[PDB]
Every structure is written in C-alpha cells, then in structure tokens.
Design a protein around this ligand. Structure first.
Ligand SMILES: Nc1ncnc2c1ncn2[C@@H]1O[C@H](CSCC[C@H](N)C(=O)O)[C@@H](O)[C@H]1O
Ligand SMILES: Nc1ncnc2c1ncn2[C@@H]1O[C@H](CSCC[C@H](N)C(=O)O)[C@@H](O)[C@H]1O
Lengths: 202, 202
C-alpha cells in the first residue's frame, strides 16, 4: 500500500484527490502553528518580491508526518521536471508526503533538515507558474495512483459514426488491415510530433 | 472579463476551480446525451486499447457553450506544451472553454468541426499521463487566472530565524549589500539550473 499525506494551507483545494492499495490524508499546515495569527510566512532574508514560508512550522509538521521510509515531494517551479518515469518510480513507494508551498516558496532549510532523515525530491510539473503546490500535487498524485494495482505523440482517434458533419473517418481505419492501420497511425504520429513537439525528435 | 466554461464527465473534480474579472461554470457532458445509458464513449475505429469519446455528444455540447469568440482548449498528451507565454496569452481572452477528455481522448472530428467556427488549441501540461483532462484544466485555469487584474530557475529563499536546527541563513543575505545579494543569488540560480534543468542552457 502507498500512504499519501498532503500538507497545505488550502486543504480544501485537495478535495478532488479522493477521486487497500492507497490512502490519502490532507493536513492543514496552520495546525502546527502556535501563535494567534496562525502565521506560516515571514520576510525574505536578502530582500525579495514576496514572503517566505517559515521553517519551524514546516519542520514541526514534517516531524509528525514523515518517517525514514518517506519520500518527501516539494512541488516547486525550481524543481526537476515531473515525468512519466518519475510517476512510475513513485508508485512503488510506501509513503509519499507532498509539501505544498505558497507565497514565494518554502525556506530552503526545511528541505535541508528533512534530507537528514529521509529522501526529498523538488519537482516542477512544467514551465508555467501556479500560486501554490496544491494543483501540482493533484496532477502528480493522479499520475501516480493510476499506476497502482515508443516516443511519438499519439495521433487522432475516431469512433462511430463513419460520417459526422461532413467529416469522414479515414477509410483505412474503417477497412481494417492491421498492418495498414499501424502504418497510417505511425505516419500520423510522426507528423503530429514534428508539428507540436519537435523537441522530441532533437 | 474572461468567461471560463469546463465540460467534463466528472464535474465535481473541478470543485477547487472556485478557489467582475472572471466567471467559471462547470458542465456535465452527459447532459447532452439522449440515451438511457448517458453514453459518451464507443469503440475505436481501426482497433485500439480503449474507448473513444463520441463526437455527436461533444459537438452538441460545444454548439450550446461556444461562440465565434471562444478559444476552445482540449487538454491532451498529444498537444503543444502549456507554458507561461500560453497562460499570459489566454489571460487576454474573453471566453475559454476547456473540453476534458477521458478514456483514450476525444474523436478527432470534434476538434475539426469546432475549428470551422472558432479557435482551438490542443495542449499538454507535461510529459506524463493523467486519466482525464480535469487536473490539467485545474492547472491551466489557475495559471491563467493569477495573471488577471531571465531564464534561470529561482534559487533558495530564507526567512527568520537566522539559525534553525544547526542550519544558518547564508551570511550574505543577512548582511545585506544589494549587489552582493544579487551576485550570490545569480550564482545559486545558475548552479541550480545546471543541476536540475540543463535543457534550459542548451
Ligand atoms: N510549475 C510548478 N510546479 C510545481 N509547483 C509549482 C509550480 N508553479 C508553482 N508551484 C507552487 O507554487 C508555489 C508558489 S510559486 C508562485 C509565487 C508567487 N505567487 C509569485 O509572485 O510568483 C511554489 O512554492 C510551488 O509549491
Ligand atoms: N499531460 C496531459 N496534459 C493534458 N491532458 C492530459 C494529460 N494526460 C492526460 N490528459 C487527459 O487525459 C485524457 C485521457 S489520457 C489517459 C488515457 C487512458 N487512461 C490510457 O489507457 O492511457 C486525455 O484525453 C486528456 O484530456
């Protein structure tokens, strides 16, 4: 079984995450604060464009939630790119903890302290900016959980009816020789990949 | 104002999307079915590993929801990569419709028919596989809405206290000359980018 914990100051954003193999629990980071303000952020050392999430609150939360078996994931635009191989690799883990940042991110010493006792991966889901780690956590959790018990883009798929609004299903798919269908699909996959993702051809 | 419509067979997955500039409405695709089964999928022409979403249900839904001003987004792993420039560009639109696929995706003629009357972008959020377009829609909507009224990864940030669990904030950030802080941050950004995203240096 894989146990998944998510820590966030917007726990309700993880509501879709529910939709004996996997367990999910979402925690409010403000539960490990001790001040009337329930403060989780503070001013950046060196100056900066926003606030930074405090280390003591995070360390206290991670002390309670994680153990030596934990793989701690920190969603961040400064991370390694999430990919299918990463999702497969994480699917074998027994305990994933997703630490969701907001503001400008989490004080670096949270990760440095955690790495003393567990494994930690900082991961971006793509080259675009979100407000927080929660949506990235939804994507990574879904990608992983769907893996529990070539290199061309996929081309177009069709289903019935054979004609719809003057647009016909390509005849080779209707008149089906397996070899001809595969050939047609490979050509479509290659053209699509050239058009949309030339990086995948180098 | 930007009006955002999402169409999905799992409308509840778009619940976080709520958290005079932007309007969001989620629709159940099965509302445009007419059979007792509320069927939205059918067998792939040419053979295939799964079912394909029917065109007539989608065209009927898109007839009701879209107009000539609409930019229709189809989340798909076969799409162009979503990026920050795309999110900025979409933030200027007046009407975004997100067509969420499941199973093996949507019959290609849905996109071909829609492109007769509107603009259509097929977009992937990254090189990993989800079950459906709904989580990708959460990411793209968040990236866009946060834009409404260099090229190195960001390095580490710190906030108080200056020492925590034997880990000190780097002294240059505490003893702050603006030029020295910027220099230190540029070096950290460069090393981090080399380590985690060498593709960004080519
Ligand atoms: N592409 C991405 N992948 C993973 N997490 C991301 C992400 N984009 C943003 N995040 C999450 O969002 C948090 C804040 S990033 C946004 C910072 C702030 N709004 C600003 O002025 O830019 C990060 O710490 C990370 O947890
Ligand atoms: N990286 C990505 N970016 C955008 N949409 C994606 C995506 N990965 C999956 N999707 C969405 O998920 C839908 C089904 S893809 C999964 C297909 C099926 N479960 C299988 O056997 O592989 C796509 O049509 C698209 O809407």
């Amino acid at each position: 079984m894989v146990r998944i914990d998510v820590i966030s100051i917007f726990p309700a954003y993880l509501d879709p995450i529910r939709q004996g193999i996997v367990s999910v629990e979402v925690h409010d980071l403000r539960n490990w604060t001790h001040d009337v303000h329930r403060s989780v952020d503070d001013s950046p050392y060196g100056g900066g464009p926003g606030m930074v999430m405090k280390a003591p609150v995070w360390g206290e939360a991670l002390d309670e939630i994680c153990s030596e078996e934990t793989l701690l994931v920190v969603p961040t635009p400064a991370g390694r790119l999430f990919d299918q191989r990463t999702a497969q690799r994480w699917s074998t883990e027994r305990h994933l903890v997703f630490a969701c940042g907001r503001y400008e991110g989490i004080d670096q010493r949270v990760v440095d302290d955690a790495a003393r006792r567990m494994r930690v991966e900082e991961v971006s889901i793509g080259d675009y900016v979100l407000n927080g780690g929660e949506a990235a956590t939804l994507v990574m959790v879904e990608a992983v959980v769907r893996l529990l018990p070539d290199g061309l883009l996929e081309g177009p798929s069709y289903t019935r009816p054979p004609s719809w609004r003057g647009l016909d299903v390509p005849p080779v798919l209707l008149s089906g020789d397996h070899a001809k269908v595969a050939a047609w699909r490979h050509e479509q996959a290659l053209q699509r990949t050239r058009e949309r993702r030339p990086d995948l051809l180098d």
